[PDB]
Amino acid sequence: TIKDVAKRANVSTTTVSHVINKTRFVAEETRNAVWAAIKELHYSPSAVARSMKVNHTKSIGLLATSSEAAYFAEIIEAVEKNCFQKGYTLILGNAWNNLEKQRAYLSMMAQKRVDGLLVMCSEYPEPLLAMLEEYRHIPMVVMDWGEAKADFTDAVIDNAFEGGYMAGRYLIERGHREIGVIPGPLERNTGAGRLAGFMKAMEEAMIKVPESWIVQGDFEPESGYRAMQQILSQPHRPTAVFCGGDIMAMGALCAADEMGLRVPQDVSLIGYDNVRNARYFTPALTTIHQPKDSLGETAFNMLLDRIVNKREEPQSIEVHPRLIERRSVADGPFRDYR
Amino acid sequence: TIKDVAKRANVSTTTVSHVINKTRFVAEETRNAVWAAIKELHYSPSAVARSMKVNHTKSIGLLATSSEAAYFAEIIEAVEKNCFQKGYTLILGNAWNNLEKQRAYLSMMAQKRVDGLLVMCSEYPEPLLAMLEEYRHIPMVVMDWGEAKADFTDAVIDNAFEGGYMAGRYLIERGHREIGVIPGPLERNTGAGRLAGFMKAMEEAMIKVPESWIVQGDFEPESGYRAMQQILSQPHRPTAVFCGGDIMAMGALCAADEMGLRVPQDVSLIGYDNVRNARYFTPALTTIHQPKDSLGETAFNMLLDRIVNKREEPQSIEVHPRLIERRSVADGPFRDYR
DNA sequence: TACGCAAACGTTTGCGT
DNA sequence: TACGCAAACGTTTGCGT
Ligand code: HPA
Ligand code: HPA
Structure with a gap:
């Protein structure tokens, strides 16, 4: 089709190409004419052809x-x-x-x-x-x-590790010593990695998270919902929970509410990600960004x-x-x- | 490079092409050999070249x-x-x-x-x-x-219109007659279109929404937050609000909470979209899907x-x-x- | 039977003049 | 000065034999 453009313009396609890519000087007249055709002909250069020569898409x-x-x-x-x-x-x-x-x-x-x-x-x-x-x-x-x-x-x-640590630290510094955790898939960095940063701060503080208190999530709200449930659904419950991701946290929020637990008054929750609309979570979610x-x-x-x-x-x-x-x-x- | 493949295989590229696209019968032997080369040579056919001939990317x-x-x-x-x-x-x-x-x-x-x-x-x-x-x-x-x-x-x-209507209807059938609305951009279908479906049901019910009661949103949580605020922030307030989109609604929820208003006990809210995680909004959001x-x-x-x-x-x-x-x-x- | 030739797809660009 | 030629990029495919 560049051929058809060259023709309407009565110049070589080489010319046409040069003006289309300002790759060498072209007479004004000439350059206009090319555009002229380029336009009536309604020309769209082909990237595929181009890519064919220049070697990059x-x-x-x-x-x-x-x-x-x-x-x-x-x-x-x-x-x-x-x-x-x-x-x-x-x-x-x-x-x-x-x-x-x-x-x-x-x-x-x-x-x-x-x-x-x-x-x-x-x-x-x-x-x-x-x-x-x-x-x-x-x-x-x-x-x-x-x-x-x-x-x-x-x-x-x-x-993601120093992230996990930041979170635990806060909880600790906040007066909490009975903490639970709902981490994300351990086969992922944001999962295992955040968990461990958290776990170190605990050890550092001689805090011991009961295994009945750590429940895997998958980053999806439902998994958060189920975890929270399981957590508060036991005899002895923590006063604070660290949630591996915001969306799961959002899920952790809904369940507490559904069980009539007040947050942060009954359980405190800290999440992780600082997703675009965690501020509008109800309550505004405290999290690691x-x-x-x-x-x-x-x-x-x-x-x-x-x-x-x-x-x-x-x-x-x-x-x-x-x-x-x-x-x-x-x-x-x-x-x-x- | 198909050329280099043909060579290693001592056959024509045409052959190579045929076996790569099973576009005509090829001797087993032959076909294997091609694959053989295809593999050592570590061959990746070029879609760009292909697209060049076949005419479609x-x-x-x-x-x-x-x-x-x-x-x-x-x-x-x-x-x-x-x-x-x-x-x-x-x-x-x-x-x-x-x-x-x-x-x-x-x-x-x-x-x-x-x-x-x-x-x-x-x-x-x-x-x-x-x-x-x-x-x-x-x-x-x-x-x-x-x-x-x-x-x-x-x-x-x-x-989107019958959607708007469905929403109003429900509210009406629910015992509500003092309703507010926070629509999305009127320059959009999901905006103006949902609003009008809603508005018809109102007229149909001889319900009149005070202009102090309809506040534009932009589909973003913040806009929802501000609208709700403005709405409940007045002398006379509705008992129910229809919110043009879930995410804005989520924003409308947070503000009520922040103003100490209970939902649905103080204001009822119906949204629109039925986004993947509206169920985990707090309360689980009633909405048009x-x-x-x-x-x-x-x-x-x-x-x-x-x-x-x-x-x-x-x-x-x-x-x-x-x-x-x-x-x-x-x-x-x-x-x-x- | 089972395969190979050579043109063609739409541009870019080294040389020339 | 300001431009044109012709080869080349990596495949597909109509004819042949
Ligand atoms: O793997 C992930 N999936 C979803 N949300 C996430 N936030 C952190 N990591 C993830
Ligand atoms: O235009 C839109 N933007 C964002 N969310 C939406 N939901 C419906 N329409 C829209």
């Missing part, structure tokens, strides 16, 4: 876990912002923690020749670490590990780097969680004794 | 408004599911109701030659209707109008149709809202008198 692939989940969604929306402004196109792919699903998206992606790959799989079994390696050729960063699982990729680390925007921008950036400045060596950038005091936590019985 | 573009918003997110995740299973690749593009932003994504998309276009712009000014037309050549459906704004596209209609999954699947479908069976004529499919009784609504003063 100017498109990036997001190999995600899921996109509805608030936490996730927020990150994604950030990443997209970044692609858009640096001219990239985003191909969002959700694998739902399915190996087969992952092996697929991974493949479709390579085939569509994505300039780079953004990775958010939540859990990384050897089998997954494996496939990922088979693509070391395509530039990629994983945005959700705690340490650097591998050498063939970039990594942004969230400091995870910089998600920076998590995205910073991920897009290492990638762009690797891409544009052809970087070869892996790299890793830390990011930092920070406590956000809201209204779901009250003083514990030991406040005054410290 | 097997990729679809989602020209959305934003993706963090629950409502939105849910729809999107559905659409992606559908693309994935019918082999399509999703390019998610957020225009934030920005014309310039839209003119851009639209263009990048055409250029990347997307097989079809999914449209979710929220608001459609003539200027937007205009650009969209310039692309009548690319198959597309808009998933968010109430009626069929144009002839060059497919349309799935949500019946919008089939979002079907909204997506049904959108992907008309498109695929247009695509594959080269359909030319516009088409439109209705979908239906339905009331979900939860715990945020209580009997009104007139229940018994009916």
Whole structure:
């Protein structure tokens, strides 16, 4: 079709190309004429053809876990912002923690020749670490590990442990000594990693969480609902609970209410993520905030780097969680004794 | 590179192609050998090259408004599911109701030659209707109008009006006659459209909503918070409020609580959307559910149709809202008198 | 029988003049 | 000075034999 444009304009396609990409000087007249045709002809250059020669699609692939989940969604929306402004196109792919699903998206992606790959799989079994390696050729960063699982990729680390610790600390400093915890999947960083930061502060304080007091969640409200239930549904109950994620917490809130327990007056709750609308949780949720925007921008950036400045060596950038005091936590019985 | 594969296998690339696409019979031996090379060589066919000949990228573009918003997110995740299973690749593009932003994504998309276009712009000014037309050549459906704004596209209609009506009705039948409303942007279907369905039921019941009682929202929790405030913050207040969207409602809940108002005991609240976690709103939110999954699947479908069976004529499919009784609504003063 | 040739898809770009 | 030629990018596919 560039051919048809060149014709209407009575010049070479080479010319046409030059004016379309301002890649060499072109007579005003000439340049106008090209536009002229470009317009009537209603021309849309073909990126596929272009990509064929220039060797880069100017498109990036997001190999995600899921996109509805608030936490996730927020990150994604950030990443997209970044692609858009640096001219990239985003191909969002959700694998739902399915190996087969992952092996697929991974493949479709390579085939569509994505300039780079953004990775958010939540859990990384050897089998997954494996496939990922088979693509070391395509530039990629994983945005959700705690340490650097591998050498063939970039990594942004969230400091999910110091997050866990921050949370426990607060509760402790608040007068609490009978605390429960509903963590997320231990096969995930935000899961095991947050739990352990929390657990260290406890040990540090000689606090011992009864096993009847720690209940796995899956980051979904329902899991929170069930955990809280189980927790307050026992003879002896804690005065405070640390909830691995905001959405689950939101679920933990509803159950207390349903059992007629007042929060923070009956149980104090601290969550984690500081999701876009935790402030409007009822009560306004006190939580650890995870910089998600920076998590995205910073991920897009290492990638762009690797891409544009052809970087070869892996790299890793830390990011930092920070406590956000809201209204779901009250003083514990030991406040005054410290 | 297919060339390098053909070589390792000592056969023509044509052969290689045939076995890669099972497009004509190939000797077992032969076929194995090809795979053999395909493997050591570590071959990934190029979709871009392929697309160059076959004329279709097997990729679809989602020209959305934003993706963090629950409502939105849910729809999107559905659409992606559908693309994935019918082999399509999703390019998610957020225009934030920005014309310039839209003119851009639209263009990048055409250029990347997307097989079809999914449209979710929220608001459609003539200027937007205009650009969209310039692309009548690319198959597309808009998933968010109430009626069929144009002839060059497919349309799935949500019946947002009968939704509005359902909501009012309930409130009426519940004993309520002093109702307030916090609608969403009137420049959107889910906004004006839901409001009017609501307003008709009122008129039908000879109920008159005082203007001091209707406050615009923007679908975001904060806007809900402010509206509720303004509403209950007056001398005379309603006993029930219809909230244009769940997330705003969630915001409307927090403010009542903050003003020490009990819900549903002091004010009853009915929302709209039936978002994934309204059940865990505190109280479990009574709302009108919008089939979002079907909204997506049904959108992907008309498109695929247009695509594959080269359909030319516009088409439109209705979908239906339905009331979900939860715990945020209580009997009104007139229940018994009916 | 089972396969190979060569043109074509829509652009970019090294040389020329 | 300001532009045009022709090869090349990686596959698909109509004909042949
Ligand atoms: O893996 C996760 N899923 C959902 N929400 C989350 N918040 C932190 N980690 C997660
Ligand atoms: O335009 C909208 N935005 C956000 N949530 C919504 N729910 C219905 N319509 C909308």
